[PDB]
Write a protein that binds this ligand. Structure first.
Ligand SMILES: Nc1ncnc2c1ncn2[C@@H]1O[C@H](COP(=O)(O)OP(=O)(O)O)[C@@H](O)[C@H]1O
Ligand SMILES: [Mg+2]
Lengths: 209, 50, 241, 221, 233, 316, 258
């Protein structure tokens, strides 16, 4: 629904630094390498005065309190514990910031979710009708479009698409228009892309529903 | 931690409306925004136990 | 999430029955393919026919069976499981006629086999037989009936169905064809079916390596069209198109 | 106990009497010997009341489950087959003789199911105590393809003959007209025998036989 | 987490949780949208009937079926399991009718279907019925709406929704639901709660609605449902 | 009450053709008394007064409002006004909504509020107060509008009719923006929207919230894209409801498309499927002003501004 | 690992799955029970009164096993229904055979033998249920027992099972008159313990269920207190605590004056 993009946009209108990592990058293999990388990341954040640290997918490491009865769940919990220490600890950060995107937001640890010195919460829901109209406007102003290509009748139609979906609709419509060799897209192009990336979530087994 | 967050969120609410004062209702909204007790809506999983 | 895969009665944490899905995968493993289309007053089923040896007898090799006089079936899946399911359907049809005293509607016959398969998917016995069974018949009130009885428990009624390897392309083509004047004649339905199979296969059909069966509101019997009928339809209709 | 049934132009017309004798004593005056197997199938029971009632109920339950499964009204061949097969599985101890009738997509039907499980499709059927007189009247005054009113009059006169010529026959003549359009259940259509018109009042005034003990209990509201 | 204790159904967990029934409920939630509303003088059940094509004859398999002319039943979850439960529910209703000459009270029918689910959720080789049932009924004079879950648990509802987006359905019903909602408006509320969950155009033929009032449970025909949809839109 | 319904229908025919006869017949129906057990007659006569108010709207005949607010109150405490207060709501709304000035103006609304105070029916007292606040805003007495709104919302945070809470909050936001305290108007709008995201928002209230959101964003944040988005949501809602004030929403839409320095889209919007029934000098004025902005011709710009007065001279 | 089967003994002699069920009972609702010379009572915590649910069943956790006995259930709902049905069947079987309402001890022993069979036989998980039985029997008058999943039952003057049941029983120990408590005092104490154990510090009729058994006119009466009486008790207790708080404030004022 657009959170990587708002992160990149703050990076655009940022003045300090935007250090991006993916939770897998901490989930790397070899004991203590994940904590090593988290500590290196936060140390870089600090050595830079106002820098920002972004973690793209935290559900991999940020988990609940599972009593690790193996050698691997224990290491994942170790990654999370090192993250907690670095975010808050005996070495209170100096003007450093942290951003996370999780995509689940339910099984995160109560620690990392500590509604205190560790995190605030924000919502990024499915583009409503308003947001979706803005999606169309922002994506499509750059393209070249006909006069019978009204987007306002591609929003009122109920549909549980997102911002990525609408970008894909527009890109696929333009691709199809060029394939059929016109330099102006048309309502047929948008119809075809609409049906190409709305019903794509199909071919499922029907006995489940 | 919740207490710190409540004070901080009341302060940010004050920051919102070009104001340098925090009021009781602002603290209340801060409490609501900080102590978000997410609850499972799956009534079946919730009624499994009598 | 591959640990919830070795038993037909253990759910996955995301609510999926993997060994129910694998029965459909077995359908696709059948190798052959089948299609069916229902018109205003007719119902036609078309099906592959592979005879990869000169000693195989085309008289025996066939996947269009006669469950009873008025109801016929096309199989898509392992042949042994298909024939067991065919025997079961024959049994249930006969028992229905014996108890309730009138020919079983296709509705109920497909329902009944669907429920047998459902019993097998729930109680951890058997091994859900891997065949997809498409039934055709004549119903006095509604008219022609085409139904499909997947090996997980759906007995759904179809305006035009496809089963087997080319199911997706067949369904696409049938949607495209149906969207134009669904009121089809006997010959037009026979065509629609044969043309759908030919196009989804990128092949042209010999009059023998295809099995076609038909029922009609004037002929309520499962007529397995012979070599003559298959050849005539193919050649003449492709020519006159 | 006398029941009768005829098939007319549009459907079926069934007619039973109202009496069930436990010996030579008239236990009931207004028994319900026509029973509902489905919205278009009614069954007239004669013989042992308990078994006819329970057999009709079980068959109605099976046929209603069948109807809710099919979506189409049950057809009388199924009712007849279930009845006969059950009554034969029980080698005859179910003293229920059932004039089954109905109207289905294939027109009317009127079966007669004897206790042992022998069935006989027929235009007119009477079986029971007074089937004697009922069938006499039918044979003497039946003409194929009657209309509603004439069929009703015929199957009422037959039951009247049963009433007036068979001990243990009823006091009221109940009818059931079944067709694709109507399901009339006349209960009772006619009252051949009304009452004796009791003579001068002879009650016993308040206070005629005192008591020995009382435990009047104050049950709540 | 409690990993080992999730492949069976006769083995508790340290938390005390039987994982397999919760998985079944996940399967249930991963099903079609269905909504139920208890009006002041009736009950309304609706359920998305969307097919994967125009090929499926969308009149052959219904989803809102009767169990008597005062009780009816709709579902979310799987379909074969649903057919089995509907068959057994009709059988239980008729058994009760024979034993006691009185149409089965909806509470008792719900209790017995729940007992059936319990039978199926308590042995080492029986898969819990993955389907959750909404049972509508009219007993005495008070409409009843119950929910039966794979766990053998039965519970009353003023109004609910189940399927892929039950959270959204239930918040919408919470907003729009008032006790004295006569049936003609309960139908609109149910259809709207289906709209807020129903991708694509809610044509009159891809939606199934069944209403249970004093006259007896009845599944609305395509003409009636089309009329209602046009009125709402 | 078939005979009474026939009398009411012939009164409607007289409304169509000879209105005075309809007025007299409805007045007689009102004068008719009602039983103490049944309610069919009171239903008939309340519909009769509704159509009498319709007659007053059609003919500007507000002279009866004194009676309709003085002599009908006594009997009205018979149909459990706790739920029938919608009737008084409609009566007062239509009254104050006729084309001609009511003369009494706030006087009659205050009389109604005092009558409700005597009745001790707070449920309707709240509605009367909210409508009075709207009247104050319409007459531009923003200060007293704001005062009553603050009192009423302080009361409504602890009582029922959260829809009326949203109404009063939006009235306060409109008054705040009129007084030009944009930060406080935005605060009121955010409160109204948070309270609206917990209850059912009819199309009218949802579109009003969207329009006010558009006005506030247009004024303050200079995020005219979001301003246009909200304005268009309001326009679609008002078009769906068939509401008089959809032309205003469309004008704001065109205004956003102009102030974004993209005047080429004004014509596209005006010649747009939805925005045909609303065609007229209102939209042609934005057309001309956007043409002037496109050609960067201040002469034509001022020409249009003077030529389209009352289309771009009055809406603040 | 000695917990994959009910019938498996651990090397330290513990039936793990039995302990698993016993601890699982904690996650259920909260039931407490008090015996008094005049009567007996149970209290139950309605965990879930989401306003879109309904109140069709007057009792969602307390059941009437026969005219002389009631039982509160806590645990898995399916097992709860199964066990309550078996309890009713046992009671009426005893009535048929002997013609005297079953002694509460005998009924509890029967059901707990059923649970023992389950914990000792084949592939059947132990019933994940704990029950509190109240009743009257001609042998030992009023009586209250608690039965666990392991089939073990204890006769308790007062007791509690469920969430924070340890705290509930601690407060029962503190405030229970071992031989003098009457029914009204029992209700007061039950309300106090419920208020202190329920997660919400504020009680109401929307979260509690009280059941009272008393012998009147020679016959037993099992009454589930209506919301009116429930709210009156909740009030009386809350205002009593408020009066105690006012007395504490007066004591603080006196100390300040000193
Ligand atoms: N509001 C928006 N405006 C334009 N594009 C959007 C918007 N929201 C999402 N997108 C599209 O989504 C893609 C980025 O999605 P992303 O933020 O990575 O989602 P996630 O990170 O949750 O998978 C971009 O390619 C962009 O085109
Ligand atoms: Mg990203």
């Amino acid at each position: 629904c657009g959170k990587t993009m708002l992160a990149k946009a703050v990076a655009h209108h940022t003045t300090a630094a935007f250090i991006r990592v993916v939770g897998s990058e901490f989930v790397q293999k070899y004991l203590g390498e994940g904590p090593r990388m988290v500590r290196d990341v936060f140390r870089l954040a600090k050595e830079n005065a106002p820098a920002i640290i972004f973690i793209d997918e935290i559900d991999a490491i940020a988990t609940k309190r599972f009593d690790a009865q193996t050698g691997a769940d224990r290491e994942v919990q170790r990654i999370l514990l090192e993250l907690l220490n670095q975010m808050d600890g005996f070495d209170q950060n100096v003007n450093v910031k942290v951003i996370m995107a999780t995509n689940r937001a339910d099984t995160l640890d109560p620690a990392l979710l500590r509604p205190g010195r560790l995190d605030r919460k924000i919502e990024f829901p499915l583009p409503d009708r308003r947001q979706k109209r803005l999606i169309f406007s922002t994506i499509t102003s750059k393209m070249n479009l006909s006069e019978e290509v009204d987007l306002e009748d591609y929003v009122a139609r109920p549909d549980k698409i997102s911002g990525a979906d609408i970008n894909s609709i527009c890109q696929e419509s333009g691709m199809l228009a060029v394939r059929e060799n016109r330099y102006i897209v048309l309502a047929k192009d948008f119809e075809k892309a609409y049906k190409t990336v709305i019903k794509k979530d199909e071919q499922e087994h029907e006995f489940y529903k | 931690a919740e207490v710190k967050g409540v004070c901080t969120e009341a302060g940010m609410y004050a920051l919102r409306e070009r104001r340098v004062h925090v009021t009781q209702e602002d603290f209340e909204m801060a409490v609501a925004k900080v102590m978000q007790k997410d609850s499972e809506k799956n009534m079946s999983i919730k009624k499994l136990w009598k | 999430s591959a640990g919830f895969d070795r038993h037909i009665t253990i759910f996955s944490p995301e609510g999926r029955l993997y060994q129910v899905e694998y029965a459909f995968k077995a359908i696709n493993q059948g190798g052959l393919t089948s299609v069916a289309v229902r018109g205003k007053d007719c119902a036609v089923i078309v099906t592959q026919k592979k005879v990869p040896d000169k000693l195989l007898d085309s008289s025996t090799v066939t996947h269009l069976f006669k469950i009873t006089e008025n109801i016929g079936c096309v199989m898509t899946g392992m042949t042994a499981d298909s024939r067991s399911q065919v025997q079961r359907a024959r049994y249930e049809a006969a028992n229905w006629k014996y108890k309730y005293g009138y020919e079983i509607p296709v509705d109920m016959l497909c329902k009944r086999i669907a429920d047998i398969s459902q019993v097998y998917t729930q109680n951890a016995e058997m091994r859900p037989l891997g065949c997809c069974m498409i039934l055709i018949g004549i119903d006095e009130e509604q008219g022609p009936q085409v139904y499909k009885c997947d090996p997980a428990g759906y007995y759904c009624g179809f305006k035009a169905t496809a089963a087997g390897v080319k199911q997706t392309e067949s369904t696409s083509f049938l949607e495209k064809k149906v969207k134009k004047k669904f009121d089809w004649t006997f010959e037009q339905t026979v065509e629609t079916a044969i043309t759908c199979l030919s196009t989804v296969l990128s092949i042209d059909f010999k009059p023998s390596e295809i099995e076609v069966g038909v029922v009609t509101v004037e002929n309520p019997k499962f007529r397995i069209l012979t070599e003559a009928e298959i050849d005539a339809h193919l050649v003449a209709l492709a020519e006159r198109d | 106990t006398t029941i009768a049934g005829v098939v007319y132009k549009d459907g079926i017309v069934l007619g039973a009497d109202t009496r069930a004798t436990e010996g030579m004593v008239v236990a009931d005056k207004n028994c319900s010997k026509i029973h509902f197997i489905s919205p278009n199938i009614y069954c007239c029971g004669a013989g042992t009341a308990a078994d006819t009632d329970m057999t009709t109920q079980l068959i109605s339950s099976n046929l209603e489950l069948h109807s809710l499964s099919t979506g189409r009204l049950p057809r009388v061949v199924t009712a007849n087959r279930m009845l006969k097969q059950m009554l034969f599985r029980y080698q005859g101890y179910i003293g229920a003789a059932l004039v089954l009738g109905g109207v289905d997509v294939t027109g009317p039907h009127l079966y007669s199911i004897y206790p042992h499980g022998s069935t006989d499709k027929l235009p007119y059927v009477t079986m029971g105590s007074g089937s004697l007189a009922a069938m006499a009247v039918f044979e003497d005054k039946f003409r194929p393809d009657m209309e509603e009113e004439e069929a009703k009059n015929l199957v009422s006169e037959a039951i009247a003959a049963g009433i007036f010529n068979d001990l243990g026959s009823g006091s009221n003549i109940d009818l059931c007209v079944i067709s694709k359009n109507k399901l009339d259940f006349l209960r009772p259509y006619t009252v051949p025998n009304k009452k004796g018109t009791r003579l001068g009042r002879y009650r016993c005034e308040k206070g005629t036989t005192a008591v020995l003990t009382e435990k009047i209990t104050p049950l709540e509201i | 987490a409690e990993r080992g204790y999730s492949f069976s159904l006769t083995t508790f967990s340290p938390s005390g949780k039987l994982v397999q029934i919760e998985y079944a409920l996940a399967a249930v939630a991963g099903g079609a949208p269905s909504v139920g509303i208890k009006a002041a003088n009736g009950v309304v059940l609706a359920t998305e009937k969307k097919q994967k094509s125009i090929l499926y004859d969308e009149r052959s398999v219904h989803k809102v079926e009767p169990i008597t002319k005062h009780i009816g039943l709709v579902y979310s979850g799987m379909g074969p399991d649903y057919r089995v439960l509907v068959h057994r529910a009709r059988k239980l209703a008729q058994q009760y009718y024979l034993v006691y000459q009185e149409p089965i009270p909806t509470a008792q029918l719900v209790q017995r279907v729940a007992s059936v689910m319990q039978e199926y959720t308590q042995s080492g080789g029986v898969r819990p019925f993955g389907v959750s049932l909404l049972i509508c009924g009219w007993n005495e004079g008070r409409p009843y709406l119950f929910q039966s879950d794979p766990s053998g648990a039965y519970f009353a509802w003023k109004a609910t929704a189940m399927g892929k987006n039950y959270v959204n359905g239930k918040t919408f019903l919470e907003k729009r639901y008032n006790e004295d909602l006569e049936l003609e408006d309960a139908i609109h509320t149910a259809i709207l709660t289906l709209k807020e969950s129903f991708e694509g155009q809610m044509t009159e033929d891809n939606i199934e609605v069944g209403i249970c009032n004093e006259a007896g449970f009845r599944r609305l025909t395509p003409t009636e449902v089309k009329d209602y949809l046009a009125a709402i839109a | 009450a078939a005979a009474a319904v026939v009398e009411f229908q012939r009164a409607q025919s007289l409304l169509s053709t000879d209105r005075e006869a309809s007025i007299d017949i409805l007045h007689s129906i009102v004068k008719r008394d009602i039983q103490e057990n049944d309610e069919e007659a009171v239903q008939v006569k309340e519909q009769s007064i509704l159509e009498l108010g319709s007659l007053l709207a059609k003919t500007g005949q507000a002279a009866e409002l004194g009676g309709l607010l003085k002599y009908v109150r006594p009997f009205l405490n018979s149909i459990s006004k706790a739920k029938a207060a919608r009737l008084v709501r409609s009566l007062l709304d239509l009254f104050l909504d006729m084309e001609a000035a009511t003369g009494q103006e706030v006087e009659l609304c205050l009389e109604c509020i005092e009558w409700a105070k005597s009745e001790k029916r707070t449920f309707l007292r709240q509605a009367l107060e909210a409508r009075l606040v709207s009247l104050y805003f319409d007459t531009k007495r923003y200060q007293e509008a704001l005062h009553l709104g603050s009192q009423l919302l302080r009361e409504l945070k602890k009582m029922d009719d959260k829809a009326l809470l949203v109404e009063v909050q939006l009235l306060e936001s409109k008054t705040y923006h009129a007084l030009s305290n944009l930060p406080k108007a935005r605060a009121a709008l955010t409160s109204a929207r948070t309270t609206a995201n917990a209850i059912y928002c009819p199309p009218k209230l949802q579109a009003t919230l969207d329009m006010q959101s558009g006005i506030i964003h247009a004024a303050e944040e200079k995020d005219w894209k979001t301003a246009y988005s909200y304005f268009y949501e309001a326009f679609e809602g008002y078009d769906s409801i068939d509401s008089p004030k959809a032309i205003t929403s469309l004008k704001y839409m065109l205004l956003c498309k102009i102030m974004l320095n993209t005047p080429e889209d004004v014509q596209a919007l005006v010649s747009g499927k939805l925005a045909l029934r609303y065609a007229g000098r209102q939209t042609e004025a934005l057309k001309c002003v956007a043409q002037a902005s496109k050609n960067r011709s201040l002469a034509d710009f001022e020409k249009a501004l003077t030529d389209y007065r009352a289309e771009l001279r009055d809406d603040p | 690992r000695y917990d994959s089967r009910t019938t498996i003994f651990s090397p330290e002699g513990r039936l793990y799955q039995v302990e698993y069920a016993m601890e699982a009972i904690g996650h259920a609702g909260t039931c407490l029970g008090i015996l008094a010379n005049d009567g007996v009572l149970l209290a139950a915590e309605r965990r879930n009164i989401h306003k879109l649910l309904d109140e069709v069943f007057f009792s969602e956790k307390i059941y009437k096993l026969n005219e002389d006995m009631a039982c509160s259930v806590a645990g898995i709902t399916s097992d709860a229904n199964v066990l309550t049905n078996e309890l009713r069947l046992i009671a009426q079987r005893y009535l048929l055979q002997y013609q005297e309402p079953i002694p509460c001890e005998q009924l509890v022993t029967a059901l707990c033998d059923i649970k023992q069979a389950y914990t000792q036989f084949g592939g059947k998980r132990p019933f994940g249920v704990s029950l509190l039985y109240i009743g009257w029997d001609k042998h030992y008058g009023f009586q209250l027992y608690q039965s666990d999943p392991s089939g073990n039952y204890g006769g308790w003057k007062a007791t509690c099972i469920g969430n924070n049941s340890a705290a509930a029983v601690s407060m029962l120990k503190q405030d229970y008159k071992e031989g003098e408590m009457t029914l009204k005092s029992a209700l007061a104490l039950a309300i106090k313990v419920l208020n202190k154990t329920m997660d919400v510090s504020k009680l109401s009729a929307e979260k509690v269920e009280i059941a009272t058994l008393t012998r009147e006119n020679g016959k037993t009466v099992i009454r589930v207190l209506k919301q009116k009486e429930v709210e009156q008790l909740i009030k009386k207790h809350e205002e009593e605590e408020a009066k105690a708080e006012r007395e504490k404030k007066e004591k603080e004022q006196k100390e300040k004056d000193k």
